[PDB]
Short mmCIF file of C-alpha atoms in Angstrom, two decimals:
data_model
loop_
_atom_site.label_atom_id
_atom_site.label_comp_id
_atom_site.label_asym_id
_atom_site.label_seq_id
_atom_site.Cartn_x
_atom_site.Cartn_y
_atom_site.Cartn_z
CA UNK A 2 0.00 0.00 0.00
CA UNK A 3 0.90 3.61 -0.99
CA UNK A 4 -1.47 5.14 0.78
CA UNK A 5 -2.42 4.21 4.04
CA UNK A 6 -4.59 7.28 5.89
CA UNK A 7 -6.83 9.84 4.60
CA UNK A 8 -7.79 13.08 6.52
CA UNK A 9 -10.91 14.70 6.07
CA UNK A 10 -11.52 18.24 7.67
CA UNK A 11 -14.85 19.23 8.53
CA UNK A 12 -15.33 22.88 6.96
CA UNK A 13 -17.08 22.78 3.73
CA UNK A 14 -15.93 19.18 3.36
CA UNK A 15 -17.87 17.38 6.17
CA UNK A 16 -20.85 20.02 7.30
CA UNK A 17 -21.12 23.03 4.75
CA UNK A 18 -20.33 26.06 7.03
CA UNK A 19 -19.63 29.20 4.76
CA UNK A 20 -23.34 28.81 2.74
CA UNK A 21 -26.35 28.14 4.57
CA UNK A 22 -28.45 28.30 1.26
CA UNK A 23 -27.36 25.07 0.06
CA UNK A 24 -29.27 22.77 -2.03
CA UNK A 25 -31.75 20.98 0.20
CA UNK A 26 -31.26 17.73 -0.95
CA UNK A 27 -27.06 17.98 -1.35
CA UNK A 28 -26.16 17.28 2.48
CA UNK A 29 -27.99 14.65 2.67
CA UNK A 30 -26.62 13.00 -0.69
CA UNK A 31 -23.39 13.93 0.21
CA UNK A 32 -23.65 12.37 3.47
CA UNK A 33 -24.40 9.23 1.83
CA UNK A 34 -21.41 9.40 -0.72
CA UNK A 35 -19.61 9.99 2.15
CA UNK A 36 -20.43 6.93 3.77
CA UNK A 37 -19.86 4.64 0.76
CA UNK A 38 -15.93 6.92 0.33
CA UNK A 39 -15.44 5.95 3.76
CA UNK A 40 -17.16 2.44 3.34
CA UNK A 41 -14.57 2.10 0.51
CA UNK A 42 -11.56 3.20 1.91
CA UNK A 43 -12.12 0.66 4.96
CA UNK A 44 -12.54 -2.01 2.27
CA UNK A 45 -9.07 -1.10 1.13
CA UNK A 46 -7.74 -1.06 4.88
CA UNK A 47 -7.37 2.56 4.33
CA UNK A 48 -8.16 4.88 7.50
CA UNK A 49 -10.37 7.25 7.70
CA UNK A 50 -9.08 10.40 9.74
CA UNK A 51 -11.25 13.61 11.00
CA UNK A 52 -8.24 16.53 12.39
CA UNK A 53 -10.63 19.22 13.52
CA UNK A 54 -9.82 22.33 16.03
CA UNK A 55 -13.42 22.56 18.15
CA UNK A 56 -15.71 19.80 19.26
CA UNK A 57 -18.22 22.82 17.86
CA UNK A 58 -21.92 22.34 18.28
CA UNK A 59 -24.04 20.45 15.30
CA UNK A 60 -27.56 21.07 14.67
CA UNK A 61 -29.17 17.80 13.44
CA UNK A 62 -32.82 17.66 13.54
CA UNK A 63 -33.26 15.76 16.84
CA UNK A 64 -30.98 18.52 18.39
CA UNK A 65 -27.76 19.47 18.92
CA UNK A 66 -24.43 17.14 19.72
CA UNK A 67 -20.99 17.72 19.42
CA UNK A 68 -19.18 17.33 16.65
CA UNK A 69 -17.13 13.66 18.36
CA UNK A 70 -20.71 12.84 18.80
CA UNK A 71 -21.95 13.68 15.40
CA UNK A 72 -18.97 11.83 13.61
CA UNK A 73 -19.08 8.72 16.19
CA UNK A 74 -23.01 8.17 15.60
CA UNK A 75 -22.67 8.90 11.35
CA UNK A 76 -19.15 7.61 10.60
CA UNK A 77 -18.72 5.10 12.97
CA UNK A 78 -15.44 3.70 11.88
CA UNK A 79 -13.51 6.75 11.70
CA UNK A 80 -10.28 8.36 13.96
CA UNK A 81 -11.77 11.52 15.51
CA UNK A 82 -8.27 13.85 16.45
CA UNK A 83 -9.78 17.11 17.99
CA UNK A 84 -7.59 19.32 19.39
CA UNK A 85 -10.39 20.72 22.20
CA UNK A 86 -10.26 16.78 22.98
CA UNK A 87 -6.49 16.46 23.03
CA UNK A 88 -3.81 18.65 23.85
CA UNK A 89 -0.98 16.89 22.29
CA UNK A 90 -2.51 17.81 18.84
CA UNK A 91 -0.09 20.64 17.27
CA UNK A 92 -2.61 23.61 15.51
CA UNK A 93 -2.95 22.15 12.47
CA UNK A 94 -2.28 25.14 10.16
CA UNK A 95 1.38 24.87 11.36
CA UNK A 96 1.67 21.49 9.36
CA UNK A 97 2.44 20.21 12.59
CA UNK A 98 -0.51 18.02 12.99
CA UNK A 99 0.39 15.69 10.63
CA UNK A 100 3.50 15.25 12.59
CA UNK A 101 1.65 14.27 15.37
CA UNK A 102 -0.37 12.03 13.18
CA UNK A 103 2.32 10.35 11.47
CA UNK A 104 3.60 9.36 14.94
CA UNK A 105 0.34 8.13 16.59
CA UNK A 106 -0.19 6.04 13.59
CA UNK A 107 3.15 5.23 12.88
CA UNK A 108 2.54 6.31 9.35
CA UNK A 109 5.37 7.87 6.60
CA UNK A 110 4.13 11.59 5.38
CA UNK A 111 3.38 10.37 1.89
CA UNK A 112 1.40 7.44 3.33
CA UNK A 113 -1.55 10.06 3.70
CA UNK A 114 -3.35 12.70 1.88
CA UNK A 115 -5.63 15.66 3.24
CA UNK A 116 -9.31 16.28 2.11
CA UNK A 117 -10.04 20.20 2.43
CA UNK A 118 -11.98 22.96 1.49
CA UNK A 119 -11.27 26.14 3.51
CA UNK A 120 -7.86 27.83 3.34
CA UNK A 121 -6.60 26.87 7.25
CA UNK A 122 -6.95 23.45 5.87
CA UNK A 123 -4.93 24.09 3.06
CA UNK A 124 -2.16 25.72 5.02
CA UNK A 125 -2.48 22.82 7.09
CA UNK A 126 -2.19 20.21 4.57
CA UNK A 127 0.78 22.12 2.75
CA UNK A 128 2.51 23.11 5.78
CA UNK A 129 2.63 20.02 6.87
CA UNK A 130 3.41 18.76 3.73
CA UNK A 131 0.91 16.70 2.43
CA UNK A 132 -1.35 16.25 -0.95
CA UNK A 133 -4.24 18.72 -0.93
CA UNK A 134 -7.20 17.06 -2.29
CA UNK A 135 -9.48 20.59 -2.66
CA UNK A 136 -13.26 19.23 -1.87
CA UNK A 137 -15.10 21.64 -3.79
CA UNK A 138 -18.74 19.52 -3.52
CA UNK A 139 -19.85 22.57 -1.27
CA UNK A 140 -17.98 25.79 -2.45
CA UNK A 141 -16.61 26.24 -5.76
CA UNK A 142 -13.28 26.98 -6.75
CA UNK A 143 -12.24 28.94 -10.08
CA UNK A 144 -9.14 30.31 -9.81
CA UNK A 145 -7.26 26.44 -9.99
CA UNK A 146 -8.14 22.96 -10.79
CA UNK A 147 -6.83 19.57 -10.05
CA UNK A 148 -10.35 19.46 -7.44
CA UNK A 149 -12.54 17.09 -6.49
CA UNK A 150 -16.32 17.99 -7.15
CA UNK A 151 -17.93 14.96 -5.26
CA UNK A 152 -16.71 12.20 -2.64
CA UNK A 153 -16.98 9.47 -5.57
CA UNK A 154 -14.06 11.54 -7.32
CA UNK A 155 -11.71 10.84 -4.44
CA UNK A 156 -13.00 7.31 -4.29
CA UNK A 157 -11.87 7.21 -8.09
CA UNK A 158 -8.60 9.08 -7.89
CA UNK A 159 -7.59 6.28 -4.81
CA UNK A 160 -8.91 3.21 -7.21
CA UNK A 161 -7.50 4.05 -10.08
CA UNK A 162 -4.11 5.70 -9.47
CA UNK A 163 -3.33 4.95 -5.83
CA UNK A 164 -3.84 1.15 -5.08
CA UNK A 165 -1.28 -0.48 -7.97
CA UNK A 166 2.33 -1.49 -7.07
CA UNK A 167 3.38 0.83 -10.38
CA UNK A 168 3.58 4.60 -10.29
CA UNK A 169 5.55 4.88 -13.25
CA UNK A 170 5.86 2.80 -16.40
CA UNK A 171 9.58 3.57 -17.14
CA UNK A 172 11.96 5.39 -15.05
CA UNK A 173 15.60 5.60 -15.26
CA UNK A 174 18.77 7.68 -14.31
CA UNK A 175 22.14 8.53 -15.32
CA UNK A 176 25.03 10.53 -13.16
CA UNK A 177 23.62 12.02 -10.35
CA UNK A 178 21.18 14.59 -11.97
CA UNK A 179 19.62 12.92 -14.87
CA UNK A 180 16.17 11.55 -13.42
CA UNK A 181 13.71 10.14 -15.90
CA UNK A 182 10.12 9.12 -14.91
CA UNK A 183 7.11 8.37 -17.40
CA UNK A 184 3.82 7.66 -16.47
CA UNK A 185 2.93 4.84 -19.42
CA UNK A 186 4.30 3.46 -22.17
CA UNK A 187 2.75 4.04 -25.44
CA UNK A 188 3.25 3.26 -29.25
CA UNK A 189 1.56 3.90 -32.23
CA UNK A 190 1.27 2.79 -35.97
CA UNK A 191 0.76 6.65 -37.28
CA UNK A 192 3.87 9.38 -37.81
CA UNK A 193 2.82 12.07 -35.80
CA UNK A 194 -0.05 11.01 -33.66
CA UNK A 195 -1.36 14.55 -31.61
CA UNK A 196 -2.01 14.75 -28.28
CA UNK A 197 -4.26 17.71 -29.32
CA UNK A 198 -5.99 19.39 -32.58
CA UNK A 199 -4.01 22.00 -34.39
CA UNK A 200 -6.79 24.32 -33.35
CA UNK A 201 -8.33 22.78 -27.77
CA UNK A 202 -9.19 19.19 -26.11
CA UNK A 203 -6.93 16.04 -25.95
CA UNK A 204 -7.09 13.33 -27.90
CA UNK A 205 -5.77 10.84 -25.61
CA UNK A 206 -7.38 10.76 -21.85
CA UNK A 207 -8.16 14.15 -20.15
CA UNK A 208 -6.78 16.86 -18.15
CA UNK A 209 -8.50 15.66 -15.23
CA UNK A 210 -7.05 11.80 -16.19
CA UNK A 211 -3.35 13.21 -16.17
CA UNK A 212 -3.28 15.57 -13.61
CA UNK A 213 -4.97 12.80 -11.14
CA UNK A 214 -2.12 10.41 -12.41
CA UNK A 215 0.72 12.97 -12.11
CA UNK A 216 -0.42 13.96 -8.93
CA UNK A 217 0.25 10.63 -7.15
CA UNK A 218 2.71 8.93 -8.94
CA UNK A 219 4.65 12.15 -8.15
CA UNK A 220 3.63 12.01 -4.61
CA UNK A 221 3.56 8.83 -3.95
CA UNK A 222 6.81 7.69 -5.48
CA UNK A 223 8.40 10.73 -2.91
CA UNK A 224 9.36 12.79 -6.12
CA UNK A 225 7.54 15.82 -5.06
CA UNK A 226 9.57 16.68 -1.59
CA UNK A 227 11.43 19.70 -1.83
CA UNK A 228 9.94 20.67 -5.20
CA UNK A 229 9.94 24.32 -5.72
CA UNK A 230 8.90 24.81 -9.21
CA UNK A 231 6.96 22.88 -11.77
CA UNK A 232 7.02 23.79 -15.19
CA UNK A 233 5.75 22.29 -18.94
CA UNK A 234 8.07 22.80 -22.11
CA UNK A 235 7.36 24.32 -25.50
CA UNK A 236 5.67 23.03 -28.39
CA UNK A 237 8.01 23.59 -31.62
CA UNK A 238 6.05 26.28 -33.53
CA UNK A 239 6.92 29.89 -32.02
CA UNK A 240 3.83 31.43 -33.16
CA UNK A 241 1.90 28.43 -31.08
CA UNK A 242 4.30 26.97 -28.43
CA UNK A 243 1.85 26.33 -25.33
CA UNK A 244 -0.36 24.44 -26.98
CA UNK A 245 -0.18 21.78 -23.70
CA UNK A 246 0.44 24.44 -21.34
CA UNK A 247 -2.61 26.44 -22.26
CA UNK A 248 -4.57 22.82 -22.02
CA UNK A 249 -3.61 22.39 -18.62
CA UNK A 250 -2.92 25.47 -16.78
CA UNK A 251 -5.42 25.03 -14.81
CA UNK A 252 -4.54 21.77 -13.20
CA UNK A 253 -1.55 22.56 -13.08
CA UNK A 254 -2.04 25.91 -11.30
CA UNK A 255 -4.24 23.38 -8.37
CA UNK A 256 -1.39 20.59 -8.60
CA UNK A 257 1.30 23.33 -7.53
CA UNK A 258 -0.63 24.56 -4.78
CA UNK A 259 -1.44 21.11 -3.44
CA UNK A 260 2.06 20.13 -3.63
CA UNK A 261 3.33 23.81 -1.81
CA UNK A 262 5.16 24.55 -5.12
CA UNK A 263 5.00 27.22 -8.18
CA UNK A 264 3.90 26.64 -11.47
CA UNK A 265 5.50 28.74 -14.13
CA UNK A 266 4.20 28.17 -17.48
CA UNK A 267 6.42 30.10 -19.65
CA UNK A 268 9.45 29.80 -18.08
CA UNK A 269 9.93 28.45 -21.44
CA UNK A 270 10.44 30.36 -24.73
CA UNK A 271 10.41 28.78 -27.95
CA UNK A 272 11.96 32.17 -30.00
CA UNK A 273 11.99 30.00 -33.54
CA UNK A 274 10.05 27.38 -34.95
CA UNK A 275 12.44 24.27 -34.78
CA UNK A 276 11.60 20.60 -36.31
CA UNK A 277 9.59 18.32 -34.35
CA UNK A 278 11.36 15.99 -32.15
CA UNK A 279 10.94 14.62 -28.66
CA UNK A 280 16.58 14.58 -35.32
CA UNK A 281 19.68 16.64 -33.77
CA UNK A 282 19.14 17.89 -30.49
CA UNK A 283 20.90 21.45 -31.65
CA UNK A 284 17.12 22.43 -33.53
CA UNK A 285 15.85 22.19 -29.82
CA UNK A 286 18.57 23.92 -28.38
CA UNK A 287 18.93 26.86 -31.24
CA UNK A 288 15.60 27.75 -30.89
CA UNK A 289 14.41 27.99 -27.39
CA UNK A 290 15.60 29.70 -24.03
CA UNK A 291 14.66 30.29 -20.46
CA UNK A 292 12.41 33.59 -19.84
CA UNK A 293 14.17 36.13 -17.72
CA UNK A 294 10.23 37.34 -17.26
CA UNK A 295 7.62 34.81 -16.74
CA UNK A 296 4.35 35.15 -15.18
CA UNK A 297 5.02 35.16 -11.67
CA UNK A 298 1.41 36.10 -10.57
CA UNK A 299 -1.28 33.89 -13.12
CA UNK A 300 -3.91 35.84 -11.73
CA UNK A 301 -2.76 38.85 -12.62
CA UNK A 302 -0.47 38.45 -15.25
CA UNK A 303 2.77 40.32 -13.35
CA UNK A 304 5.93 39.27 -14.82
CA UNK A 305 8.94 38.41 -12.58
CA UNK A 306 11.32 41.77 -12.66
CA UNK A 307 14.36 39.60 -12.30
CA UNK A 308 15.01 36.45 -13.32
CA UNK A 309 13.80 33.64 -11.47
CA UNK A 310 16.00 32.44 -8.72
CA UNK A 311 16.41 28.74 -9.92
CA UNK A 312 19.53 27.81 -8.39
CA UNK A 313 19.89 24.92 -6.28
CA UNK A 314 15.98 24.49 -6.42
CA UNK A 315 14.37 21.43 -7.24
CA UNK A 316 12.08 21.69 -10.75
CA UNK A 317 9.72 19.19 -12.12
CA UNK A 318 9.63 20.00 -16.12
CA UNK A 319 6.52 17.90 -17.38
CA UNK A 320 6.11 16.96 -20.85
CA UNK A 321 3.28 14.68 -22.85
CA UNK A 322 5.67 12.60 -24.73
CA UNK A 323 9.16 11.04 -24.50
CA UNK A 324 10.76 9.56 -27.27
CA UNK A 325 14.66 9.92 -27.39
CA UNK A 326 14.75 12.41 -25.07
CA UNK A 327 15.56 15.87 -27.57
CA UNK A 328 12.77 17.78 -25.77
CA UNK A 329 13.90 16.53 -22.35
CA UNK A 330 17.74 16.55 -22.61
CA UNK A 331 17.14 20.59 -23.89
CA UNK A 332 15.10 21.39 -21.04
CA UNK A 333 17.27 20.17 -18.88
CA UNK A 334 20.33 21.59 -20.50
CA UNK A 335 18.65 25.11 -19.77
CA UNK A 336 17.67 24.67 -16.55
CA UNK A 337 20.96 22.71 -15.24
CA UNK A 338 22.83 25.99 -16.57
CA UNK A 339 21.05 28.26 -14.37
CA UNK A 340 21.81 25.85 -11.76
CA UNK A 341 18.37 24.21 -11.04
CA UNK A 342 18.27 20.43 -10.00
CA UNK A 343 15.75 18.82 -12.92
CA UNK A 344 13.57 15.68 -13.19
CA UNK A 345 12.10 14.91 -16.11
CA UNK A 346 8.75 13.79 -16.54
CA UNK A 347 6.84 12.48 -19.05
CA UNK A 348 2.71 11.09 -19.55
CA UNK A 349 4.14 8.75 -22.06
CA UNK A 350 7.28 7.09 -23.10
CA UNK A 351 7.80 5.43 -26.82
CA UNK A 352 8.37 1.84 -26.70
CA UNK A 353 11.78 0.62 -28.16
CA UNK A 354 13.18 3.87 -27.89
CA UNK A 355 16.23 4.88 -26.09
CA UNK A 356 16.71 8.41 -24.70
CA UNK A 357 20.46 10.05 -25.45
CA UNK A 358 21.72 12.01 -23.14
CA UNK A 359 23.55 15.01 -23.68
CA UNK A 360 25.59 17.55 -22.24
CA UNK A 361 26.96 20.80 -24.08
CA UNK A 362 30.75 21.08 -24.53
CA UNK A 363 30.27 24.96 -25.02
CA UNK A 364 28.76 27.56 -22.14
CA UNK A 365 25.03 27.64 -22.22
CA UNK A 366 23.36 31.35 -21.76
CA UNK A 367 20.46 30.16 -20.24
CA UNK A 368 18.26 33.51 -20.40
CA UNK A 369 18.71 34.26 -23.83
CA UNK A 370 19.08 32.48 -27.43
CA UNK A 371 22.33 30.16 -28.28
CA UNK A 372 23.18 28.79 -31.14
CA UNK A 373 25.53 24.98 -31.18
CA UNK A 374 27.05 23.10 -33.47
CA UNK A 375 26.27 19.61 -33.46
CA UNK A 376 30.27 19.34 -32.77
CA UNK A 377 29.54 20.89 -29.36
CA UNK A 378 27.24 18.51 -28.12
CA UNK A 379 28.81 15.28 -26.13
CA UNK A 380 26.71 12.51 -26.25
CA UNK A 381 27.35 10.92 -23.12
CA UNK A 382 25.26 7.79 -22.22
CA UNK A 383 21.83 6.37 -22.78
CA UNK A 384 18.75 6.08 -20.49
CA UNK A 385 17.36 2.39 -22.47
CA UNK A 386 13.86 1.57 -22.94
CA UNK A 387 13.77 -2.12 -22.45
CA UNK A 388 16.31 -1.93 -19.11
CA UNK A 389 14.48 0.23 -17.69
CA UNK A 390 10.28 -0.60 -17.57
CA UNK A 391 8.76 -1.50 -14.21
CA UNK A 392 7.31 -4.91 -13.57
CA UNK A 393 4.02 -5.11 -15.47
CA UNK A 394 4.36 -2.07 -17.89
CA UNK A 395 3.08 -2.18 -21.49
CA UNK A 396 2.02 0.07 -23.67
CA UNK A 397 -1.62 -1.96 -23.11
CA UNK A 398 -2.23 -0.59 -20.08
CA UNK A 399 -2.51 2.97 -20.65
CA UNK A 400 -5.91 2.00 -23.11
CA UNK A 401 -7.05 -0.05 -19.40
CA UNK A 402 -6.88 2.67 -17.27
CA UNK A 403 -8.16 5.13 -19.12
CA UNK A 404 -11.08 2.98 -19.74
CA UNK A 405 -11.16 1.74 -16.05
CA UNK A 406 -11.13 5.85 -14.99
CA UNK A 407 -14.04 6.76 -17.39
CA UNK A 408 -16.23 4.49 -16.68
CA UNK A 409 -15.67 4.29 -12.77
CA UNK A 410 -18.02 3.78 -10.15
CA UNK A 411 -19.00 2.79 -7.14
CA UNK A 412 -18.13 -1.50 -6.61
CA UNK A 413 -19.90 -4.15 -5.01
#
């Protein structure tokens, strides 16, 4: 098992405290999808956790309990950690009550994830380092996605993405900072299959599919921890180059803030349109940079005024496909020059195809355009395909789970 615990909070997750104008048939429906996510989890050996602050009052209709009484009498087989009841519970938007937690249950960090609404719970989650899952059944959310609209989505998430021994597909490393994760393998009997229309939707999965799978194979697998910045790559046309980016910005936005990171999504600059390749390296190289002013503020649209300070942090570059690595390797080429540690992720790696690795045998500018000669590129190992799949992995599976996550519900 990868995950082991969740928490729920009670704000807007549990009772629906901001509104009182609700629906007047939601509470009670999402009492009962409540039941049948907790019914689930329990089925899975998962615990069920409630971390609340006050044993506050609860009107129900034949009066009013507390809320230990409330949760006892509707979700029985639950952990009830109130801090009003126990004074060795840290305040939980100091992160510090899922220290205590992870004690008491003798549980790792990344053995749990959080269930919130309100922002104290997400300080509390993300202080205390742990996956937000943003419950947004009672109060909507717009400015971010990667949410979870109704307890059967969390159900699905766990099913589907959290309960198999594989996280990732392939995976592989060379020296010490060349790190290599895909999420599937894929291959195809077309030349340039799309992930997306020229003109924007997917044409494989979903953004809701991929963000739900990045999300905990990167959390899971302990590859988010001390992430500071994640960050996608450029398509190859420079009068279209965030094709991807502009698909997923808004999952990616909500997967930054549950992980306690930054998303910058043109950190990136493709300056001239290069040849497609995920072909020599130097077209990927020759035509893109690093942005000395990306959008540091996606609500606004406010521009960094000096470059961003990338050294010695830890980056998470996400891309949809790896092939041999040309996309990858230039990314990382860029980013290693400004001094950032990079991993390299991918949704999907190409069967039978190795990825080169690279390293540039002139000085890299990395906020502003070069221009190499193949001659000053050394070629200096090779990240396999075959060596390095995890048990089970085949470029089958990826059809399976999509299929298995659209048409999920509810077992018997």
């Amino acid at each position: 098992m990868y995950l082991k615990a969740v928490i729920f909070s009670i704000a807007d997750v549990v009772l629906p405290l901001t509104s009182n104008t609700q629906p007047q048939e939601l509470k009670s429906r999402i009492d009962s999808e409540l039941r049948k996510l907790f019914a689930f989890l329990s089925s899975k050996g998962i615990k069920v956790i409630f971390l609340t602050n006050k044993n506050r009052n609860v009107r129900t209709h034949d009066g009013i309990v507390t809320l230990d009484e409330y949760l006892k009498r509707k979700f029985p087989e639950s952990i009830h950690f109130c801090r009003e009841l126990d004074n060795n519970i840290p305040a939980k938007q100091t992160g510090k009550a899922i220290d205590f937690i992870m004690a008491a249950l003798e549980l790792k960090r990344n053995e749990m994830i959080y269930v919130g609404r309100s922002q104290e719970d997400l300080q509390a989650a993300t202080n205390g380092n742990t996956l937000f899952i943003n419950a947004t059944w009672y109060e909507p959310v717009t400015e971010y996605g990667f949410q979870f609209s109704e307890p059967k989505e969390i159900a699905r998430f766990i099913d589907v993405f959290c309960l198999r021994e594989q996280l990732w597909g392939w995976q592989g490393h060379f020296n010490e900072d060349v790190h290599y994760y895909a999420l599937a393998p894929f291959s195809t009997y077309v030349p340039e299959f799309t992930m997306y229309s020229a003109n924007a939707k997917l044409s494989v999965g979903s953004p809701d599919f991929w963000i739900r799978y990045l999300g905990a194979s990167i959390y899971f697998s302990g590859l988010s921890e001390g992430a500071s910045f994640i960050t996608t790559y450029v398509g190859h046309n420079a009068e279209d180059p965030y094709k991807l980016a502009n698909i997923m910005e808004h999952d990616l936005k909500g997967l930054a803030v549950s992980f306690k990171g930054k998303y910058l999504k043109d950190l990136f600059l493709r300056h001239t349109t290069a040849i497609k390749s995920q072909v020599n390296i130097t077209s990927q190289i020759n035509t893109v940079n690093l942005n000395p002013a990306p959008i540091k503020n996606l609500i606004t649209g406010e521009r960094y005024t000096n470059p961003p300070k990338l050294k010695g942090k830890k980056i998470l570059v996400i891309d949809d496909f790896c092939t041999e690595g040309n996309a990858h390797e230039t990314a990382r080429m860029y980013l290693k020059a400004a001094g950032a540690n990079v991993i390299n992720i991918s949704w999907l790696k190409t069967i039978n195809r190795d990825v080169s690795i690279c390293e540039p045998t002139r000085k890299i500018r990395p906020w502003e355009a070069n221009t190499l000669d193949v001659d000053d590129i050394n070629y200096v190992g090779t990240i396999g395909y075959a060596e390095n799949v995890t048990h089970g992995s085949a470029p089958q599976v990826l059809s399976e789970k999509i299929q298995q996550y659209d048409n999920w519900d509810w077992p018997q």
